[PDB]
Design a protein around this ligand. Structure first.
Ligand code: G3H
Ligand code: G3H
Ligand code: G3H
Ligand code: G3H
Ligand code: CL
Ligand code: CL
Ligand code: CL
Lengths: 334, 334, 334, 334
């Protein structure tokens, strides 16, 4: 009956995908692969600084752990191709290590015996990049490796698609005021990728930086390829982020009410709408991929010439996870 | 000899203006008025969380306190018009309470006996609004009440003026990623002005909010009145902010290097220039009113149509204070 | 059929008590009094930075608001004696303003027409001070004004009671590493009670300070009156605290296992026990008044002479609140 | 004829030792070894989140960098014994990597050609452990490898020595409320040494943990070996810490005044004394190894039996660094 999921990399996304898959029927996590030990993994599953105590029960058993009476096998294998995916009958691997963000590298899971692989990051090579409820329709079923884009990309796609479809997108720039991630440093130190800004103390600074969304958007919405670009400001909150988008449009007498109303009409399970004066902590744990915030809509008009600004909240952890799981369910049924 | 300054409201700006006036000759702080007691005031002058230990010496004496052997009189008077400004021979009152941000209300200092009043915030009524080195030239000497604009306005004016003068500003939107201020709440609580967002825990949230700069900019640069607008994102750093500006320009083939070079050429004591990949804490205590950050310049080109984004750092405390003291000095010598 | 509660002061404790009263049958909040407006109050009930979104539904109606279809009346009355408690049939007032922490002052609610008043803080005068499951048994029913002690006092009582009962408490000192509260400043500023330390930036400092538990403990456990004292270190977390207690005991060969086992055996609904290496954010929202942490037990032995150190976690918000509502329920049924 | 210093590991301590050595004559940093690249190194020297902009001038030149016109050679060598210490005429290596905290491992610097090695951490094997102005006197000059103890050990030694010498120390327990360090995680993640608590988000939790001071104290003050023990609470401030010590003494009628006066009398360049109601940020960048805080002295008396509590501030970064450089200067001159 149920789809067999294996998670590669029990990091923030992996553990959160695990939690979310608990609320979805027809999906079981049967395997978890990470290089850390099980005591540490069970402990980090049980307790989460921003996302709260894990509601079920977690105990380390022989071949891995038992979560709510169910067995999850665990491995400590740094080379994906070795993994017992064949033996275990994996339907889809949720690839969250960061170390396989390439169609050809991610192929190792298929050799090891898995049917499909969903990469929880933008990925290079000949594959589809999917934001659920924006372009998942482009999955036919034959694909064996799929990127699930990025957290910011998921916050951006539904907003740009409305803007483009209803008003015609000429060009836009974007800033995500974005929570700090574990790839940033606790104290000023050398950084892994030589990034002089990720090098700095994460929780004490506004840190300018790049975004996946910037380049990976034209992959989700081909008709606006090359028309958006932008970056991030990493700031001292541990999760919860906000995308601001400033654009020029074809349509001529755009009003604040027009924009909001267009977004309200496009809302669904993936794309929320709010008129409440909320703040970042109010979206910690939410399962919308993107929450349009109508209170932040601005329109600058100077003669016939307009600049339109909008903003959308997202839990860069849970919102992205929720979107990823949705893509996973859909992918598993083709 | 030296210009006699009285500070009204020994808050963040007041105390920091006091510190700064120590480094400037021809200006003495002779009076300080605030409704708290002297022990508390001397303590808060001596010790500063973000700005460091006060370098001199501070002790509570009879009529107030002694700072580096100099006597500062202190008062506890909630009605400004009562104050002994006449008796003390105040040349200028630095007005920092928040409660006199109006030409007519601030007139109370002139009645009480002071020559001029500089308001450390945007103010209402018939008065000039001054950003030093952008439009201080518009002071002729007869003015008796002057607004010193806002911190964000000071971060913005030199940037917009270069943009307008060299490229022609059609329109622009702005976001300041801005440190939290004492008008925000420690924990989620009722707020004094009914602001549902400033109501929230300051150091635990990205908090969308409004900016003084938005409206008060056309007062500093009349030729761009009504052409900019924007807001803030209050974030968990205690001081240090960054203004991002996204604009449309008249000039047609604008490059990143064009913009940066324009800004570098306009740099002075008020307006800095940097190419160093810095972060917010890197500007804590800086005395530029605005620091242009050439690493953040971005230009989006789609056919003949460009969007230009620039960003300038500022210490919303010290940067603004340094600008304010400059305006003070200049005003005193007319 | 249900007990009628009116909450005075819709601060952190008031709103959280309101939330908690939702899960408890036989208690209805029918009135809420606070000096702010209803839009603000409904908003702050709906959204909580640390404690999450309010699960039900909240909307502003005519005489106050509707929570999950139930009507709550709201008032804006600064003199408690005026309040329509008589007219409303209030059984108990949960007094959470801070401004009535005295038997004689709190009497104003009884005049206004309420049966009993439970003060959510230590209070002065001739009244009982109660920590549920430590000494609630001392309520006979005739009392009309009761103190619910403090958050820290609630974290400490069950621990000290076990220590005293099983080993004999000679003397002890205590430190609570304690989350910052809304009585502390956002930025270095004058403070309302002249506290030079509460004056300081709350989220940027380890701030030494006093505790309610210090003096209010002998009121809960008379037999150890004058035997404990201690303070607080306010630190940059928004909720979640930890009490460390260092003691000298009568019993002679105390082991770590002895202490832990004694605590484990005394555990109940109010007083939890754990051996998991948790951290503060792990107790956000917990309903134990005190959670003993057996991983932190330490025994120092030099010859026949021992120093025993123990530690107990508490959500100084929700832990205290759950305790307070328990006392409330019990008081209402006498 | 100035002393030639080489720094191994340009981390927080290394960079701060470099800064400090600028203010000390007779000491030159001529070499710096770290595995990161020079651009990163120059950048992190120039800019410091907590300790401010580097006051001189730093530019990347050929064999390393130029600081205030002076040449500093830089290497990228993971095996210390290879390093050109002989060729460069190093007098002392300041060893700050963390990876050579053992007399036998640190011997590699002597092989590579340095005269002496001072390890900026507690170290194992046959060597002296020094806290300047507490026991530096025990250096005779023949030693070639020395440990400089730990930051907390330095905050503790002068206080314990006074307590022991004046009142006679029976036993004590200790907690340092301690700034988070770079060895803690930004977000909940696996930890390098399997530490379930260092694993957690550093800036969002009170995190119980261990301390170097606990065991390394009897090495500095042999007469109190085995008489103290204690731990840490890592809390969300980036630097600035506080040691609380709870002790039992021989002397019988100890008063608060007695203790404070004893500490006041023992104060020097390494050991400060204050009666100001300060907080953590007030000690960032201070050069005392330890600052006794007479406002936190408590004495619990029940009959003839007392518990005495004291507390001392220290910038676990700069205070420790200042102590380390003093030990360095002294070691160099034997
Ligand atoms: C979200 O997937 C990640 O934390 C941040 O990168 P973006 O490029 O901001 O998505
Ligand atoms: C500085 O003026 C103060 O923070 C207010 O901020 P604005 O962004 O200038 O309104
Ligand atoms: C909890 O009631 C409140 O924060 C007071 O803390 P204490 O340290 O218990 O006074
Ligand atoms: C100080 O050297 C470093 O932060 C380690 O702290 P301890 O508590 O002294 O181990
Ligand atoms: Cl403000
Ligand atoms: Cl309080
Ligand atoms: Cl460490």
């Amino acid at each position: 009956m149920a789809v067999k999921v294996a998670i590669n990399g029990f990091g923030r996304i992996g553990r959160l995908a695990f939690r979310r898959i608990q609320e979805v029927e027809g999906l079981e996590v049967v395997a978890v692969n990470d290089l850390t030990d099980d005591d540490m993994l069970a402990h980090l599953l049980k307790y989460d600084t921003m996302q709260g105590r894990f509601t079920g029960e977690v105990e380390v058993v022989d071949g891995g752990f038992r979560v709510n009476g169910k067995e999850v096998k665990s491995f400590s294998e740094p080379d994906a191709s070795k993994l017992p995916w064949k033996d275990l009958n994996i339907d889809v691997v949720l690839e969250c290590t960061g170390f396989y963000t390439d169609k050809d590298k991610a192929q190792a899971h298929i050799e090891a015996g898995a049917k499909k692989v969903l990469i929880s990051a933008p990925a290079t090579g000949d594959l589809k990049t999917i934001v659920f409820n924006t372009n998942h329709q482009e999955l036919d079923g034959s694909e064996t490796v799929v990127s699930g884009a990025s957290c910011t990309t998921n916050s951006l796609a539904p907003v740009a698609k409305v803007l483009n479809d209803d008003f015609g997108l000429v060009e836009g720039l974007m800033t995500t005021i974005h929570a700090y991630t574990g790839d940033q440093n606790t104290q000023d130190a050398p950084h892994r990728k030589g990034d002089k800004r990720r090098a700095r103390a994460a929780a004490e600074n506004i840190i300018p930086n790049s975004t996946g969304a910037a380049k990976a958007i034209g992959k989700v919405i081909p008709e606006i390829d090359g028309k958006l670009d932008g970056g991030a400001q990493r700031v001292p909150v541990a999760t919860g982020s906000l995308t601001e988008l400033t654009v020029v449009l074809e349509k001529q007498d755009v009003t604040v009410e027009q924009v909001n109303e267009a977004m309200k009409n496009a809302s669904n399970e993936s794309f929320g709408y709010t008129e409440d004066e909320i703040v970042s902590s109010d979206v910690v744990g939410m399962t919308y991929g993107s929450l349009f915030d109508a209170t932040q809509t601005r329109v600058m008009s100077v003669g016939d010439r307009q600049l339109v600004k909008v903003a959308a909240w997202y839990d860069n952890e849970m919102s992205y996870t929720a979107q990823l799981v949705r893509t996973l369910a859909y992918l598993a049924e083709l």
